């Protein structure tokens, strides 16, 4: 599967000027665009080589979408403060994520469009992309508003049409990096804690995309209980890192194997210290 995903954040700051608006876009786990209303020169900026060579009119068009979106999100922040009757001195956050997914088919699989206010679910297009789900009475005002203007018809048109056309174009132009998987580079470390206890750590570095499964097994059966996983983290170069740790009785290390599963591995990996 492949996906294109956008993330919008808008934050009010009463007495410090108009709310800041930040947008980022991704294809799979690769960022390709950013906009920041607070930037020195606010405009759409490339973050990947396969959109760098898009022309100045493409960039001019994207920049005007963001400036227009930033203005609309400042209005929504002021409306939302009224719906909840909040003080005008507090800072508030409005977030939106939307995107489209291609199936193994290469054809459209799903789309989505969801909103949050102050970190909590606010309103969302349902999976059919035809109806809304409102989290509370304030969001019902927005739902009544949006369905009166057939907003869902407009969003479905983009998610099922324009979004897939861009994603396909991006996948073609950036195929050297977007349609390759880089397998994890692995190793196992051991740390004795006590006479009765030791810890095994299984490392995965430099892999793309970010999805990976690290499982510790004892005598071949998976032991998800005693294992400790870190959050997958960015290396900063476009690849990702992760480790899984298990506490084992000292002396029994050879009965433990780490199972690594990644799109870049032709067959799963069995690692032993």
């Amino acid at each position: 599967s492949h996906s294109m995903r956008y993330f919008y954040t808008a934050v009010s700051r009463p007495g410090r000027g108009e709310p800041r608006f930040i947008a980022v876009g991704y294809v799979d786990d690769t960022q390709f665009v950013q906009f920041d209303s607070d930037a020195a020169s606010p405009r759409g900026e490339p973050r990947a080589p396969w959109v760098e060579q898009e022309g100045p009119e493409y960039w001019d068009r994207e920049t005007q979408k963001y400036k227009r979106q930033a203005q609309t999100d400042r209005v929504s922040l002021r409306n939302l403060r009224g719906y909840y009757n909040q003080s005008e001195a507090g800072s508030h956050t409005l977030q939106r994520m939307y995107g489209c997914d291609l199936g193994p088919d290469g054809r459209l699989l799903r789309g989505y469009n969801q909103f949050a206010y102050d970190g909590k679910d606010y309103i969302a297009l349902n999976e059919d992309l035809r109806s809304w789900t409102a989290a509370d009475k304030a969001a019902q005002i927005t739902q009544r508003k949006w369905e009166a203007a057939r907003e869902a018809e407009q969003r479905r048109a983009y998610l099922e049409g324009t979004c897939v056309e861009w994603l396909r174009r991006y996948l073609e132009n950036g195929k050297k990096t977007l349609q390759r998987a880089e397998h994890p580079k692995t190793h196992v470390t051991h740390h004795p804690v006590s006479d009765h206890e030791a810890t095994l750590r299984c490392w995965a570095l430099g892999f793309y995309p970010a999805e990976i499964t690290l499982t510790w097994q004892r005598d071949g059966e998976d032991q998800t209980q005693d294992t400790e996983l870190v959050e997958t983290r960015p290396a900063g170069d476009g690849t990702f890192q992760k480790w899984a740790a298990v506490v084992v009785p000292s002396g029994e290390e050879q009965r433990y194997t780490c199972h690594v599963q990644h799109e870049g591995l032709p067959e799963p990996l069995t690692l032993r210290w």
Binding site: A23, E62, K65, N79, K145, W146
Partner: peptide
């Protein structure tokens, strides 16, 4: 390619 701008909340 970003979505067009719709209605405020």
């Amino acid at each position: 390619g970003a979505d067009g701008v719709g209605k405020s909340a």
